[PDB]
């Protein structure tokens, strides 16, 4: 109130060397007053009051103190930079969830030297194999060289080798070899997209053995009808509806189709697919009016034959 800039700072500093050893609540309030009085550049005690209150937050348990370590470290980061990172490393380690919490913080600190920080965080046979393929070959390779080492790992590692090798049949084969150890069909469909690729895939599927065979059958059919029917016979036996859809896309479609339908009906009231596949076969026939009328004749023929069959 006496308009003293410097004498108030003398009083405040001369008080806060003994009076907080108990603790520092009124010290923080007088810090807020000193930042206020300076207002009515000068936000130094703004940081000191926040940092003291951050450390003042008691560490009870392990995750509670490690949660506070995330708060004050971010406060220290935005505003001994190495010793605060080291005391943060011991707080996170000295607390299951800290492996995902620190890694983040740790990485950030390291980024803000690189070889030592990575060895501490990384501290098993497949992990060494993943490192030797995308370590030396800064961000992404080294910025997922330690984050990756900790469900889509075989898929991401196969995409990492395909990107590293191309900048290739050496890295793609490493993904194809690790696909076999359902999963191998993903690496097979990707390597072929980049016809050996079309085939290798086929061969693999064959050797292995409803969705997996549908992908291999549709790929060999789209590339340019003999092997499409062969894959249907060694897979379809959803699966019954798939065999009907395969015959639609791939002369003797009505006869064989109807035979199959009747057989299925006999091998189990449940003749809704015989009238539906016959109505689509009639409507799909080339002729409009003549095409639509032919579809009605084909659909009604299945309905009449179905309604007269017990």
């Amino acid at each position: 109130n006496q308009k003293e800039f410097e004498r108030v700072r003398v009083i405040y500093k001369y008080a806060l060397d003994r009076i907080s050893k108990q603790e520092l609540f009124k010290n923080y309030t007088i810090f807020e007053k000193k930042f206020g009085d300076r207002r009515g550049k000068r936000r130094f005690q703004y940081e000191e009051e926040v940092k003291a209150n951050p450390h003042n937050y008691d560490a009870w348990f392990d995750y509670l103190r490690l949660v506070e370590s995330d708060a004050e470290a971010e406060a220290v980061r935005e505003v001994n930079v190495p010793p605060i990172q080291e005391k943060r490393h011991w707080k996170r380690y000295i607390y299951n969830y800290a492996l995902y919490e620190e890694l983040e913080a740790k990485d950030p600190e390291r980024t803000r030297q690189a070889s030592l920080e990575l060895i501490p965080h990384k501290k098993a046979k497949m992990w060494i194999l993943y490192a030797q393929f995308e370590i030396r070959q800064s961000l992404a390779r080294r910025a997922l060289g330690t984050s990756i080492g900790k469900l889509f790992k075989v898929y991401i590692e196969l995409e990492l080798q395909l990107r590293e090798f191309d900048r290739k049949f050496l890295e793609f084969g490493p993904e194809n070899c690790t696909s076999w150890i359902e999963l191998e069909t993903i690496l097979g469909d990707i390597d072929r997209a980049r016809l050996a690729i079309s085939q290798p895939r086929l061969d693999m599927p064959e050797v292995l053995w409803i969705d997996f065979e549908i992908e291999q059958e549709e790929t060999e059919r789209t590339r340019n009808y003999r092997r499409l029917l062969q894959r249907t016979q060694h897979v379809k036996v959803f699966e019954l509806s798939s065999g009907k859809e395969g015959s639609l896309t791939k002369n003797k479609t009505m006869r064989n189709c109807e035979e199959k339908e009747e057989r299925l009906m006999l091998l189990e009231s449940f003749e809704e697919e015989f009238g539906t596949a016959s109505d689509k076969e009639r409507v799909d026939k080339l002729m409009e009016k003549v095409k639509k009328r032919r579809k009605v004749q084909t659909d009604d023929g299945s309905d009449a034959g179905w309604e007269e069959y017990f």
């Binding site: 807020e32 206020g36 300076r38 207002r39 009515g40 550049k41 936000r43 703004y46 009051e49 926040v50 406060a75 935005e78 505003v79």
Partner: protein
């Protein structure tokens, strides 16, 4: 400038003057003025300063602390809603620190995902019964599951013909096991009809 500050030695006037320095873009100096205003007018007029002061300074940890100092009504909720998305649960705890307020928190917690919301109601229980019915029943429908069903019993017993339909539904839900409890439920609701009819 000094000619103007002479006025500061001695609210509309206040916001106006801060707007002057803002026009001169002294920025931080201007925020100081809002410091000098609020030490004066206390929790009434100070709010009238403070809402614009927040919207502005955030626009420019410090502001977080400023709300912290500030906190000692809806303004707190807007402000807290801001802080969580620019810890969230912490904010929800702050709002927790009235029915509409309970309704909000639950909404933001649902925004953080479903699991908390069932949790929120338990806090909620302690016209409010209509709200606990509004959320507890929903949680029961969503449904740990044994604790949830027993909770459905605890809530149905916690405290109205539609509610009778609710307890009857909870009894009916059982695969031939919610009958006895169901008839007991309709019996209790009938007892409520008795206490209601008994009223003058």
């Amino acid at each position: 400038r000094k000619l103007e500050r002479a006025r500061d030695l001695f609210d509309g006037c206040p916001p106006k003057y801060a707007k002057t320095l803002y026009l001169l873009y002294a920025q931080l100096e201007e925020e100081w003025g809002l410091a000098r205003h609020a030490m004066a007018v206390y929790e009434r007029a100070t709010r009238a300063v403070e809402p614009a002061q927040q919207y502005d300074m955030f626009n420019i940890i410090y502001g977080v602390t400023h709300t912290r100092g500030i906190y000692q009504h809806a303004r707190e909720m807007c402000l807290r809603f801001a802080d969580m998305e620019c810890g969230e649960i912490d904010r929800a705890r702050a709002i927790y620190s009235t029915w509409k307020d309970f309704e909000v928190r639950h909404g933001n917690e649902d925004t953080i995902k479903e699991m908390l919301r069932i949790r929120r109601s338990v806090q909620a229980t302690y016209f409010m019964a209509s709200q606990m019915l509004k959320v507890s029943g929903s949680a029961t429908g969503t449904v740990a599951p044994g604790q949830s069903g027993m909770d459905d019993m605890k809530l149905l017993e916690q405290r109205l013909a539609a509610e009778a339909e609710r307890d009857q539904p909870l009894r009916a839900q059982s695969k031939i096991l919610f009958v006895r409890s169901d008839a007991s439920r309709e019996e209790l609701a009938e007892l409520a009809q008795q206490v209601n009819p008994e009223e003058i």
